[PDB]
Amino acid sequence: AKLETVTLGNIGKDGKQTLVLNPRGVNPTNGVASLSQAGAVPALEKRVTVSVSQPSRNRKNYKVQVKIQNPTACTANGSCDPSVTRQAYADVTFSFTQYSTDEERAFVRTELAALLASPLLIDAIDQLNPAY
Amino acid sequence: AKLETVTLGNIGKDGKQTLVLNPRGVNPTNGVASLSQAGAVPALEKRVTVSVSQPSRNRKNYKVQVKIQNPTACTANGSCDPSVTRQAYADVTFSFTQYSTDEERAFVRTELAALLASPLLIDAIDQLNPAY
Amino acid sequence: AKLETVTLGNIGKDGKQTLVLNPRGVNPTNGVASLSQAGAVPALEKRVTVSVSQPSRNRKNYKVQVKIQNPTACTANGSCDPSVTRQAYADVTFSFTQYSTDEERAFVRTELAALLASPLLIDAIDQLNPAY
Amino acid sequence: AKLETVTLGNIGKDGKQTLVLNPRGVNPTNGVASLSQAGAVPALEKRVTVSVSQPSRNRKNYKVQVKIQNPTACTANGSCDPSVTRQAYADVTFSFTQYSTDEERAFVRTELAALLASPLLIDAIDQLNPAY
Amino acid sequence: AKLETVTLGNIGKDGKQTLVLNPRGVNPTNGVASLSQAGAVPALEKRVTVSVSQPSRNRKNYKVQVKIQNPTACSVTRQAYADVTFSFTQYSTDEERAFVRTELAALLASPLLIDAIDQLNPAY
Amino acid sequence: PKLPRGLRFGADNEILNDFQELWFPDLFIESSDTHPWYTLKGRVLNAHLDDRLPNVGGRQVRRTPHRVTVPIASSGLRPVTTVQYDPAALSFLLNARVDWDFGNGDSANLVINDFLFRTFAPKEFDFSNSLVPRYTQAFSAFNAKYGTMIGEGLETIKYLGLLLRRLREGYRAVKRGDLRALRRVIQSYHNGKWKPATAGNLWLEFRYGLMPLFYDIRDVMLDWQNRHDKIQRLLRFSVGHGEDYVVEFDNLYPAVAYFKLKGEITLERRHRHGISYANREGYAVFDNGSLRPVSDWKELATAFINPHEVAWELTPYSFVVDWFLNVGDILAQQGQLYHNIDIVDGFDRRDIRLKSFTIKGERNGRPVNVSASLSAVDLFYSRLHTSNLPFATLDLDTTFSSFKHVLDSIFLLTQRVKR
RNA sequence: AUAUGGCGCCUAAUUGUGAAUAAAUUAUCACAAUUACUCUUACGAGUGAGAGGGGGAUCUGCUUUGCCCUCUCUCCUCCCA
């Protein structure tokens, strides 16, 4: 899991924008690696945090956490510094047993991606229409 | 001290096996580098960890821990994937002063290595024979 | 696990010195055998203790403890008897299950040996360099 | 509430120094007034705080307190900022029974004034000598 | 009065050694320029401070002060120091000032003051 | 040109630090001779020699010019300066007294002065592998080593805010005008059912009727200043490791091939690195021309306890509102100390320093005896600014956002106070 | 059971002098000093670490040192009744 520049292509409603995320320092207090946009200011605006808690007397049950956070901002007519008027964000949480297999984890990843790609979730998020 | 594929050569009773530990990563929450045998199932990989603790206000001493983890497969004749049945541990704990020397501490290392090679420790570990 | 004179050669940074430890009396209060420098006084300076704890209510789960101590001493310019200025020490603790077997025990010990011999640990505590 | 200007005279051993104290306010908590010299500097301005109490619960006798500060104002101090070097404390405390008299209070008052004016207390306050 | 490196040659009992004094920061709290040994450590040991106090409500009467300080160590075990103070009136002339400087230098180089400084013997 | 080399102007003509020159200066070569002459005094082989010949042949060192900085933060932290001095060859004066009495009429005794020698300088070295590890553990124990003080500071500042809120309530009661309702706070300190005695007054029951409040305010704001001091001192992490490296100097002949001089020189090289932290927005443009001092912090606290104050009888309202406003000003000023705290500066330094030495003369049967003292002239010193930090940092923004929130809230509260 | 969780035991100490047994040690007690490294081991100096206090310390400073100034105290600790 080397940290470096991540180029997220074919994204958006029409799948034409691209996102470039550089890494930053990893949170020592809880071991969380972070990327943010290439910058400059949007680096401290958009964030992508990833952590993997390994087993313990509390963990059994590896837990992989993936948070994404996009602040929508703008500039008042007369102001200079943009203010954040909104905050979108999402959290993905995988829980795997110690006997889990890379096999299993991989198809899980791919199934989640394909579901996100499927029309169902497409309209369920894009339009917030429940399945009916 | 960059992490890297560690290939331990002749190994075991007759001295003919070999071990290949891939660098996993380094938990910074406690500053500990992790190595693991190449596999798929975390529960059945040979694991090793190294940490070096600097002298603090309540310690004031150099510490270095090396931990070694050897689970056994005990795969059943079908019916599901293998299950861990036994686990061998090794815990090595070097500790020195602020003023100690690379000389001293290399010397005591190679001392420990030679000791683990010597016939006494051989039967004191292998055969479980009390030192006498 | 017979006690007798132990000759560890190829010791130090360059692996050229040699250390000859003679045996001593087995501590009956806890059953611990011990070896010490050939002498005279260093016999009471540098120590290498061997312990084999058998199962019990508290144990399960044999243990084997190996504790090495090397006190660095010096003579003040004017004094006679050398006083200990620093002291180095290490402890290895092997824990084996009651069904453990010699093959795996030897596997573990020689793996410790090669790890100690590997670039990793040698850098990690000749220089106190966590793998980074 | 004391709001009176006091034009003092016969200050110092020579008796040719004069001083003026102008009110600065009242402290509506403990029945305390405040008076100062004309100026704008702590060291150059001498403090006079009189205070009068009445019985409430903790005590059954009056209290007339008087605290005078006569700081030594130095001219040459590296700039035009006359600071203080010797703080002159003068603390006077009285205690009168609720059945005393204005006659008795005036008696103690005049006796204090006369002793201060006489060459009795001058030798003990200025030259610092014991009663031979 | 530019501040720069000063090479004092022919100094000592027999006029052989040399002192290299490089300048430092002029003390803004009192406007005094400083020079110190070539270094490294002797820079904070040896000191030569120069100031020219112009007239004030207490001065009138320019006062040019030159202080020299030599600490001898082996921790500083001894400290020698000297101070020269020239007081010159406003109508004083540079003729007068150079006369005074040169006279004082010729005195310090004259036998009497070498006798009274080096061996510390009063003129008797 | 107007400002010194390492300075530049901003948008509104404000003094600012010129990063392009601070971090990427113009090196230049210099060959300024310091002591290009040596003097021998004494007698050698029955010949008194007191000439004065040169010793320096050729000099070349790269270095940076002189620069100036200005603090880029309220606490007064200054930015680091890139400096270089990498002489092609070292330099060490030797004021030795060579002398040796040989047989068959061969004696020598004299003293050398201003005699130097050039030798190799080991510039190629890097202890990054040894220094980088010594940050992770320090950061991990940091919160375990100062979380106590940080927490007590967080509670102290909230307690200050609470005190100011109660004071604001009292002042608003004063402004609206009421004698009995004004005692809402008076009942919060006496710990007792205080009864009235006569008809009081607004300003009278507020000027010192709140002495416990004033004492508490003074004490805990001095408390916060003291902890603040340490806390900002805690935003810097410098660590270095030193090692010894003995070197040999080529042969040299102070005289005309009359005796050889050899030996050894003991030096140590230490690699050091220091990481800092401060704001990530205004660090580049920090107004140094408009800020309040630190003494007024004590001034305001002691003002209400000062029993010398005439404005209580002319314009209580103005003085109290100014008290509020200046407190809010200082609070906002210190607020920037905790907004977006990240890596802002980083320097790496490599320096060589002598410790000891040895001298050995050898011309015929080891006849020379040397008893000298060594001193260096030129030492390798290279300090470079770096922005690439190849390791997990301790981003201290999340742990300070609370303090920033608190100060902003308190500033809003105090600025809300009107005449 | 690794990380770490639990159990127990333990704490300022070192050196020297008194008593110590008939005679020698001599723990217990008392008595006297020590406390971090380098420097002569003389006095004392330097540095690292921490603790506390005072100063209020930004404008055009140096820097072969990386950075608020200074005073005081400690080198098994800190806190309460």
PDB file of N, CA and C in Angstrom, chain F residues 79-151:
ATOM      1  N   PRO F  79      11.987  32.512  10.780  1.00  0.00           N
ATOM      2  CA  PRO F  79      12.292  31.477   9.793  1.00  0.00           C
ATOM      3  C   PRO F  79      13.779  31.169   9.736  1.00  0.00           C
ATOM      4  N   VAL F  80      14.080  29.972   9.265  1.00  0.00           N
ATOM      5  CA  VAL F  80      15.455  29.498   9.225  1.00  0.00           C
ATOM      6  C   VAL F  80      16.147  30.047   7.986  1.00  0.00           C
ATOM      7  N   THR F  81      17.472  30.129   8.049  1.00  0.00           N
ATOM      8  CA  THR F  81      18.277  30.757   7.013  1.00  0.00           C
ATOM      9  C   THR F  81      19.194  29.736   6.363  1.00  0.00           C
ATOM     10  N   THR F  82      19.141  29.660   5.039  1.00  0.00           N
ATOM     11  CA  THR F  82      20.032  28.774   4.308  1.00  0.00           C
ATOM     12  C   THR F  82      21.434  29.364   4.272  1.00  0.00           C
ATOM     13  N   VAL F  83      22.412  28.597   4.745  1.00  0.00           N
ATOM     14  CA  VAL F  83      23.786  29.070   4.827  1.00  0.00           C
ATOM     15  C   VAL F  83      24.724  27.983   4.331  1.00  0.00           C
ATOM     16  N   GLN F  84      25.831  28.412   3.739  1.00  0.00           N
ATOM     17  CA  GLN F  84      26.804  27.482   3.199  1.00  0.00           C
ATOM     18  C   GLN F  84      28.208  27.978   3.505  1.00  0.00           C
ATOM     19  N   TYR F  85      29.072  27.055   3.923  1.00  0.00           N
ATOM     20  CA  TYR F  85      30.504  27.336   3.979  1.00  0.00           C
ATOM     21  C   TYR F  85      31.203  25.979   3.853  1.00  0.00           C
ATOM     22  N   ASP F  86      31.653  25.686   2.639  1.00  0.00           N
ATOM     23  CA  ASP F  86      32.180  24.377   2.268  1.00  0.00           C
ATOM     24  C   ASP F  86      33.567  24.586   1.688  1.00  0.00           C
ATOM     25  N   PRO F  87      34.540  24.918   2.532  1.00  0.00           N
ATOM     26  CA  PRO F  87      35.892  25.172   2.031  1.00  0.00           C
ATOM     27  C   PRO F  87      36.463  23.955   1.317  1.00  0.00           C
ATOM     28  N   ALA F  88      37.179  24.213   0.222  1.00  0.00           N
ATOM     29  CA  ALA F  88      37.810  23.118  -0.500  1.00  0.00           C
ATOM     30  C   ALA F  88      38.797  22.364   0.376  1.00  0.00           C
ATOM     31  N   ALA F  89      39.397  23.036   1.354  1.00  0.00           N
ATOM     32  CA  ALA F  89      40.363  22.410   2.240  1.00  0.00           C
ATOM     33  C   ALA F  89      40.305  23.105   3.590  1.00  0.00           C
ATOM     34  N   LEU F  90      40.452  22.312   4.647  1.00  0.00           N
ATOM     35  CA  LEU F  90      40.340  22.823   6.003  1.00  0.00           C
ATOM     36  C   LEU F  90      41.524  23.737   6.317  1.00  0.00           C
ATOM     37  N   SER F  91      41.541  24.258   7.540  1.00  0.00           N
ATOM     38  CA  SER F  91      42.568  25.206   7.948  1.00  0.00           C
ATOM     39  C   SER F  91      42.696  25.174   9.462  1.00  0.00           C
ATOM     40  N   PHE F  92      43.925  25.043   9.951  1.00  0.00           N
ATOM     41  CA  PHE F  92      44.177  24.977  11.386  1.00  0.00           C
ATOM     42  C   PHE F  92      45.538  25.585  11.669  1.00  0.00           C
ATOM     43  N   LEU F  93      45.548  26.655  12.452  1.00  0.00           N
ATOM     44  CA  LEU F  93      46.789  27.283  12.872  1.00  0.00           C
ATOM     45  C   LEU F  93      47.521  26.396  13.869  1.00  0.00           C
ATOM     46  N   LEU F  94      48.851  26.469  13.848  1.00  0.00           N
ATOM     47  CA  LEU F  94      49.671  25.741  14.811  1.00  0.00           C
ATOM     48  C   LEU F  94      50.736  26.676  15.367  1.00  0.00           C
ATOM     49  N   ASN F  95      50.582  27.055  16.634  1.00  0.00           N
ATOM     50  CA  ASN F  95      51.569  27.875  17.331  1.00  0.00           C
ATOM     51  C   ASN F  95      52.441  26.975  18.208  1.00  0.00           C
ATOM     52  N   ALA F  96      53.216  26.131  17.534  1.00  0.00           N
ATOM     53  CA  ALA F  96      54.076  25.155  18.186  1.00  0.00           C
ATOM     54  C   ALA F  96      55.461  25.735  18.449  1.00  0.00           C
ATOM     55  N   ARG F  97      56.203  25.058  19.318  1.00  0.00           N
ATOM     56  CA  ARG F  97      57.581  25.421  19.627  1.00  0.00           C
ATOM     57  C   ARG F  97      58.474  24.213  19.360  1.00  0.00           C
ATOM     58  N   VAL F  98      58.853  24.047  18.090  1.00  0.00           N
ATOM     59  CA  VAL F  98      59.717  22.940  17.704  1.00  0.00           C
ATOM     60  C   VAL F  98      61.074  23.103  18.364  1.00  0.00           C
ATOM     61  N   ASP F  99      61.634  21.995  18.840  1.00  0.00           N
ATOM     62  CA  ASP F  99      62.973  22.024  19.409  1.00  0.00           C
ATOM     63  C   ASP F  99      63.441  20.603  19.681  1.00  0.00           C
ATOM     64  N   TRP F 100      64.746  20.405  19.542  1.00  0.00           N
ATOM     65  CA  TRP F 100      65.335  19.080  19.647  1.00  0.00           C
ATOM     66  C   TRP F 100      66.846  19.240  19.717  1.00  0.00           C
ATOM     67  N   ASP F 101      67.469  18.609  20.706  1.00  0.00           N
ATOM     68  CA  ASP F 101      68.918  18.652  20.878  1.00  0.00           C
ATOM     69  C   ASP F 101      69.486  17.321  20.418  1.00  0.00           C
ATOM     70  N   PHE F 102      70.132  17.337  19.267  1.00  0.00           N
ATOM     71  CA  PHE F 102      70.761  16.149  18.728  1.00  0.00           C
ATOM     72  C   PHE F 102      72.262  16.227  18.993  1.00  0.00           C
ATOM     73  N   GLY F 103      72.935  15.088  18.854  1.00  0.00           N
ATOM     74  CA  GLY F 103      74.358  15.030  19.128  1.00  0.00           C
ATOM     75  C   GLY F 103      75.192  15.709  18.061  1.00  0.00           C
ATOM     76  N   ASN F 104      76.503  15.455  18.074  1.00  0.00           N
ATOM     77  CA  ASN F 104      77.438  15.988  17.085  1.00  0.00           C
ATOM     78  C   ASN F 104      77.130  17.439  16.733  1.00  0.00           C
ATOM     79  N   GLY F 105      76.799  18.247  17.737  1.00  0.00           N
ATOM     80  CA  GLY F 105      76.506  19.650  17.515  1.00  0.00           C
ATOM     81  C   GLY F 105      75.314  19.883  16.609  1.00  0.00           C
ATOM     82  N   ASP F 106      74.117  19.531  17.083  1.00  0.00           N
ATOM     83  CA  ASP F 106      72.885  19.742  16.320  1.00  0.00           C
ATOM     84  C   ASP F 106      71.774  20.053  17.318  1.00  0.00           C
ATOM     85  N   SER F 107      71.496  21.338  17.512  1.00  0.00           N
ATOM     86  CA  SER F 107      70.437  21.784  18.403  1.00  0.00           C
ATOM     87  C   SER F 107      69.504  22.718  17.646  1.00  0.00           C
ATOM     88  N   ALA F 108      68.241  22.726  18.061  1.00  0.00           N
ATOM     89  CA  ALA F 108      67.244  23.595  17.455  1.00  0.00           C
ATOM     90  C   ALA F 108      66.222  23.979  18.512  1.00  0.00           C
ATOM     91  N   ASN F 109      65.802  25.243  18.483  1.00  0.00           N
ATOM     92  CA  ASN F 109      64.766  25.728  19.383  1.00  0.00           C
ATOM     93  C   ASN F 109      64.168  27.029  18.868  1.00  0.00           C
ATOM     94  N   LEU F 110      62.882  27.010  18.531  1.00  0.00           N
ATOM     95  CA  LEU F 110      62.215  28.197  18.017  1.00  0.00           C
ATOM     96  C   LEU F 110      60.711  28.023  18.170  1.00  0.00           C
ATOM     97  N   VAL F 111      59.990  29.099  17.867  1.00  0.00           N
ATOM     98  CA  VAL F 111      58.543  29.168  18.006  1.00  0.00           C
ATOM     99  C   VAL F 111      57.945  29.617  16.680  1.00  0.00           C
ATOM    100  N   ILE F 112      56.887  28.923  16.259  1.00  0.00           N
ATOM    101  CA  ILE F 112      56.178  29.199  15.016  1.00  0.00           C
ATOM    102  C   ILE F 112      54.908  29.961  15.342  1.00  0.00           C
ATOM    103  N   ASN F 113      54.532  30.871  14.451  1.00  0.00           N
ATOM    104  CA  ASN F 113      53.300  31.623  14.620  1.00  0.00           C
ATOM    105  C   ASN F 113      52.674  31.879  13.259  1.00  0.00           C
ATOM    106  N   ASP F 114      51.349  31.798  13.203  1.00  0.00           N
ATOM    107  CA  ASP F 114      50.605  32.042  11.972  1.00  0.00           C
ATOM    108  C   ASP F 114      51.047  31.075  10.873  1.00  0.00           C
ATOM    109  N   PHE F 115      51.061  29.785  11.213  1.00  0.00           N
ATOM    110  CA  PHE F 115      51.395  28.730  10.259  1.00  0.00           C
ATOM    111  C   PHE F 115      50.229  27.750  10.183  1.00  0.00           C
ATOM    112  N   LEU F 116      49.623  27.657   9.004  1.00  0.00           N
ATOM    113  CA  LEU F 116      48.417  26.882   8.763  1.00  0.00           C
ATOM    114  C   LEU F 116      48.673  25.848   7.680  1.00  0.00           C
ATOM    115  N   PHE F 117      47.753  24.893   7.580  1.00  0.00           N
ATOM    116  CA  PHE F 117      47.887  23.793   6.639  1.00  0.00           C
ATOM    117  C   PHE F 117      46.515  23.392   6.124  1.00  0.00           C
ATOM    118  N   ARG F 118      46.453  23.046   4.843  1.00  0.00           N
ATOM    119  CA  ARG F 118      45.211  22.624   4.215  1.00  0.00           C
ATOM    120  C   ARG F 118      45.143  21.102   4.175  1.00  0.00           C
ATOM    121  N   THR F 119      43.956  20.562   4.450  1.00  0.00           N
ATOM    122  CA  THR F 119      43.731  19.124   4.428  1.00  0.00           C
ATOM    123  C   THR F 119      42.329  18.837   3.912  1.00  0.00           C
ATOM    124  N   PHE F 120      42.109  17.580   3.546  1.00  0.00           N
ATOM    125  CA  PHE F 120      40.840  17.192   2.951  1.00  0.00           C
ATOM    126  C   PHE F 120      39.691  17.388   3.933  1.00  0.00           C
ATOM    127  N   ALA F 121      38.530  17.750   3.396  1.00  0.00           N
ATOM    128  CA  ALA F 121      37.314  17.915   4.184  1.00  0.00           C
ATOM    129  C   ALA F 121      36.285  16.863   3.777  1.00  0.00           C
ATOM    130  N   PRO F 122      35.916  15.918   4.653  1.00  0.00           N
ATOM    131  CA  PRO F 122      34.934  14.902   4.256  1.00  0.00           C
ATOM    132  C   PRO F 122      33.522  15.449   4.200  1.00  0.00           C
ATOM    133  N   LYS F 123      33.152  16.029   3.059  1.00  0.00           N
ATOM    134  CA  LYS F 123      31.807  16.550   2.859  1.00  0.00           C
ATOM    135  C   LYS F 123      30.769  15.473   2.580  1.00  0.00           C
ATOM    136  N   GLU F 124      31.150  14.385   1.925  1.00  0.00           N
ATOM    137  CA  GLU F 124      30.187  13.380   1.487  1.00  0.00           C
ATOM    138  C   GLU F 124      29.805  12.518   2.681  1.00  0.00           C
ATOM    139  N   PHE F 125      28.632  12.783   3.251  1.00  0.00           N
ATOM    140  CA  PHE F 125      28.101  11.970   4.335  1.00  0.00           C
ATOM    141  C   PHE F 125      26.653  12.363   4.578  1.00  0.00           C
ATOM    142  N   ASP F 126      25.872  11.399   5.065  1.00  0.00           N
ATOM    143  CA  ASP F 126      24.439  11.592   5.281  1.00  0.00           C
ATOM    144  C   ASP F 126      23.974  10.666   6.391  1.00  0.00           C
ATOM    145  N   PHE F 127      23.379  11.234   7.436  1.00  0.00           N
ATOM    146  CA  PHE F 127      22.827  10.461   8.541  1.00  0.00           C
ATOM    147  C   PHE F 127      21.306  10.490   8.551  1.00  0.00           C
ATOM    148  N   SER F 128      20.686  10.625   7.379  1.00  0.00           N
ATOM    149  CA  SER F 128      19.229  10.660   7.332  1.00  0.00           C
ATOM    150  C   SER F 128      18.635   9.366   7.867  1.00  0.00           C
ATOM    151  N   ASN F 129      19.203   8.229   7.474  1.00  0.00           N
ATOM    152  CA  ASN F 129      18.720   6.955   7.979  1.00  0.00           C
ATOM    153  C   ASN F 129      18.737   6.906   9.499  1.00  0.00           C
ATOM    154  N   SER F 130      19.671   7.609  10.130  1.00  0.00           N
ATOM    155  CA  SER F 130      19.775   7.598  11.581  1.00  0.00           C
ATOM    156  C   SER F 130      18.958   8.693  12.242  1.00  0.00           C
ATOM    157  N   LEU F 131      18.585   9.734  11.506  1.00  0.00           N
ATOM    158  CA  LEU F 131      17.842  10.829  12.110  1.00  0.00           C
ATOM    159  C   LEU F 131      16.338  10.697  11.907  1.00  0.00           C
ATOM    160  N   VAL F 132      15.903  10.228  10.740  1.00  0.00           N
ATOM    161  CA  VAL F 132      14.480  10.088  10.436  1.00  0.00           C
ATOM    162  C   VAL F 132      13.778   9.194  11.452  1.00  0.00           C
ATOM    163  N   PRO F 133      14.369   8.086  11.903  1.00  0.00           N
ATOM    164  CA  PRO F 133      13.629   7.251  12.853  1.00  0.00           C
ATOM    165  C   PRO F 133      13.315   7.992  14.127  1.00  0.00           C
ATOM    166  N   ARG F 134      14.141   8.968  14.492  1.00  0.00           N
ATOM    167  CA  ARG F 134      14.026   9.637  15.782  1.00  0.00           C
ATOM    168  C   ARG F 134      13.050  10.811  15.687  1.00  0.00           C
ATOM    169  N   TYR F 135      11.901  10.536  15.070  1.00  0.00           N
ATOM    170  CA  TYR F 135      10.792  11.479  15.048  1.00  0.00           C
ATOM    171  C   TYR F 135       9.480  10.780  15.365  1.00  0.00           C
ATOM    172  N   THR F 136       9.327   9.563  14.853  1.00  0.00           N
ATOM    173  CA  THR F 136       8.065   8.854  14.996  1.00  0.00           C
ATOM    174  C   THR F 136       7.754   8.598  16.459  1.00  0.00           C
ATOM    175  N   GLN F 137       8.707   8.002  17.165  1.00  0.00           N
ATOM    176  CA  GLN F 137       8.521   7.700  18.577  1.00  0.00           C
ATOM    177  C   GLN F 137       8.331   8.971  19.388  1.00  0.00           C
ATOM    178  N   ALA F 138       9.090  10.015  19.066  1.00  0.00           N
ATOM    179  CA  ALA F 138       8.932  11.269  19.785  1.00  0.00           C
ATOM    180  C   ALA F 138       7.515  11.802  19.618  1.00  0.00           C
ATOM    181  N   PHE F 139       6.990  11.765  18.393  1.00  0.00           N
ATOM    182  CA  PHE F 139       5.616  12.206  18.174  1.00  0.00           C
ATOM    183  C   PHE F 139       4.636  11.341  18.945  1.00  0.00           C
ATOM    184  N   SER F 140       4.830  10.023  18.913  1.00  0.00           N
ATOM    185  CA  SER F 140       3.883   9.133  19.570  1.00  0.00           C
ATOM    186  C   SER F 140       3.832   9.406  21.066  1.00  0.00           C
ATOM    187  N   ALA F 141       4.988   9.620  21.691  1.00  0.00           N
ATOM    188  CA  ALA F 141       4.999   9.921  23.118  1.00  0.00           C
ATOM    189  C   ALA F 141       4.631  11.368  23.411  1.00  0.00           C
ATOM    190  N   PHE F 142       4.649  12.236  22.399  1.00  0.00           N
ATOM    191  CA  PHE F 142       4.312  13.642  22.593  1.00  0.00           C
ATOM    192  C   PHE F 142       2.985  13.807  23.330  1.00  0.00           C
ATOM    193  N   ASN F 143       1.900  13.303  22.740  1.00  0.00           N
ATOM    194  CA  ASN F 143       0.600  13.439  23.385  1.00  0.00           C
ATOM    195  C   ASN F 143       0.602  12.775  24.753  1.00  0.00           C
ATOM    196  N   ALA F 144       1.285  11.642  24.880  1.00  0.00           N
ATOM    197  CA  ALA F 144       1.441  11.005  26.178  1.00  0.00           C
ATOM    198  C   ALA F 144       2.396  11.761  27.087  1.00  0.00           C
ATOM    199  N   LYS F 145       3.194  12.679  26.539  1.00  0.00           N
ATOM    200  CA  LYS F 145       4.121  13.472  27.328  1.00  0.00           C
ATOM    201  C   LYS F 145       3.620  14.874  27.632  1.00  0.00           C
ATOM    202  N   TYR F 146       2.655  15.391  26.869  1.00  0.00           N
ATOM    203  CA  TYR F 146       2.139  16.731  27.116  1.00  0.00           C
ATOM    204  C   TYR F 146       0.630  16.826  26.954  1.00  0.00           C
ATOM    205  N   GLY F 147      -0.053  15.709  26.726  1.00  0.00           N
ATOM    206  CA  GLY F 147      -1.501  15.753  26.712  1.00  0.00           C
ATOM    207  C   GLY F 147      -2.053  16.333  27.997  1.00  0.00           C
ATOM    208  N   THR F 148      -1.386  16.065  29.118  1.00  0.00           N
ATOM    209  CA  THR F 148      -1.824  16.619  30.392  1.00  0.00           C
ATOM    210  C   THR F 148      -1.879  18.140  30.331  1.00  0.00           C
ATOM    211  N   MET F 149      -0.768  18.758  29.923  1.00  0.00           N
ATOM    212  CA  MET F 149      -0.701  20.212  29.887  1.00  0.00           C
ATOM    213  C   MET F 149      -1.630  20.777  28.823  1.00  0.00           C
ATOM    214  N   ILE F 150      -1.753  20.094  27.687  1.00  0.00           N
ATOM    215  CA  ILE F 150      -2.659  20.579  26.653  1.00  0.00           C
ATOM    216  C   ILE F 150      -4.095  20.570  27.162  1.00  0.00           C
ATOM    217  N   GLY F 151      -4.483  19.506  27.865  1.00  0.00           N
ATOM    218  CA  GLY F 151      -5.838  19.433  28.384  1.00  0.00           C
ATOM    219  C   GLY F 151      -6.112  20.486  29.435  1.00  0.00           C
TER     220      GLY F 151
END
